[PDB]
């Protein structure tokens, strides 16, 4: 059982098992729950001077540093995590990406079309899902699975 890429851990703090998914990096305590033709996501990006293409609508040069983009990253799933903000919110205030006009959406597509890690990551959610920090050459999204 368990659905792709998921897997069981051991919280270092509580001892307790949580499950983690090695596609997605999506963590949550309670256990999970065929991969269709086109899925429909948002993601929030956030670029780092490492990133294919270092500028973004929201700073003409970007500056921080991959370490730093991750932090900022991590931040935001922590916020949407405890129902301080929501996804949409965060995406067209924060996300380095043109589709944050459209609150992160970017319309529905299929296999072979995003760069890999994206692609893989999309497939592996469930409509609803989120991911965990997903890596790209692009820089570092959060993925929300809608269709
Ligand atoms: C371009 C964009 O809107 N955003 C990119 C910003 O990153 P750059 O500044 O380019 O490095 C980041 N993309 C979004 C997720 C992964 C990445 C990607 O693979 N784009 C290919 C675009 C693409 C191909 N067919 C599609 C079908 C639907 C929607 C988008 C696409």
């Not at 991590?74 to 996804?87: A, L, M």
């Not at 890999?116 to 997903?134: C, I, Q």
């Not at 570092?140 to 699975?145: G, P, S």
């Amino acid at each position: 059982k368990l659905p792709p890429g998921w897997e069981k851990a051991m919280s270092r703090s509580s001892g307790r098992v949580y499950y983690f998914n090695h596609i997605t990096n999506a963590s949550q305590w309670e256990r999970p729950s065929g991969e269709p033709a086109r899925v429909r996501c948002s993601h929030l990006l956030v670029k780092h001077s490492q990133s294919r293409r270092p500028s973004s609508w929201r700073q003409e040069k970007i500056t921080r540093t991959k370490e730093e983009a991750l932090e900022l990253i991590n931040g935001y799933i922590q916020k949407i995590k405890s129902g301080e903000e929501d996804f949409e919110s965060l995406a067209s205030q924060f996300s380095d990406c043109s589709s944050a006009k459209a609150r992160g959406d970017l319309g529905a597509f299929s296999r072979g079309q995003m760069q890999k890690p994206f692609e893989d990551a999309s497939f592996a959610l469930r409509t609803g899902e989120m991911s965990g920090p997903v890596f790209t050459d692009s820089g570092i999204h959060i993925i929300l699975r809608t269709e």
